[PDB]
Amino acid sequence: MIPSITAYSKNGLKIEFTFERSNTNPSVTVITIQASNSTELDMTDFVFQAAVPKTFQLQLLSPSSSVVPAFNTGTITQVIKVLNPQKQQLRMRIKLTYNHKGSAMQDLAEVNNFPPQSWQ
Ligand SMILES: [Xe]
Ligand SMILES: [Xe]
């Protein structure tokens, strides 16, 4: 009912967002993030961070793990709750940090493709 989106897809790392409206607080959208890794090597010590504009509040819940396993063999799932008291267009800056092939990777990206249903 809220379309899912690919929030990020780069360097073998894909982050999908699925959305649900909170049953508790109709101003809250619950985003379930799924990180997957299409590469041959695990992405370890993986950390998702996000920031949203001033009018919103965010709660990031604990991720399912810290490894995005190679070959799409599973995902990291993590829930972000977004409170949007002013029904503003949701947009988000995400920061992804992980190790891959022994190297520290980090990328900052904007997610500006939130479906209207996620914030209207
Ligand atoms: Xe994640
Ligand atoms: Xe960020």
Curated annotation (Swiss-Prot):
It is found in: Golgi apparatus; Cytoplasmic vesicle, Clathrin-coated vesicle membrane; Cytoplasm; Cytoplasm, Perinuclear region. Widely expressed. It comes from the Eukaryota. Changing P63N: Reduces interaction with EPS15 and SYNRG. Residues 2-115 form the GAE domain. Adaptor protein complex 1 (AP-1) is a heterotetramer composed of two large adaptins (gamma-type subunit AP1G1 and beta-type subunit AP1B1), a medium adaptin (mu-type subunit AP1M1 or AP1M2) and a small adaptin (sigma-type subunit AP1S1 or AP1S2 or AP1S3). Interacts (via GAE domain) with RABEP1. Interacts with EPS15. Interacts with SYNRG/gamma-synergin. Interacts (via GAE domain) with AP1AR (via coiled-coil domain). Interacts with CLN3 (via dileucine motif); this interaction facilitates lysosomal targeting. Subunit of clathrin-associated adaptor protein complex 1 that plays a role in protein sorting in the late-Golgi/trans-Golgi network (TGN) and/or endosomes. The AP complexes mediate both the recruitment of clathrin to membranes and the recognition of sorting signals within the cytosolic tails of transmembrane cargo molecules. Belongs to the adaptor complexes large subunit family. This is AP-1 complex subunit gamma-1. It comes from Mus musculus (Mouse). The lineage of its organism: Eukaryota, Metazoa, Chordata, Craniata, Vertebrata. The chain holds residues 704 to 822 of 822 of the full protein.
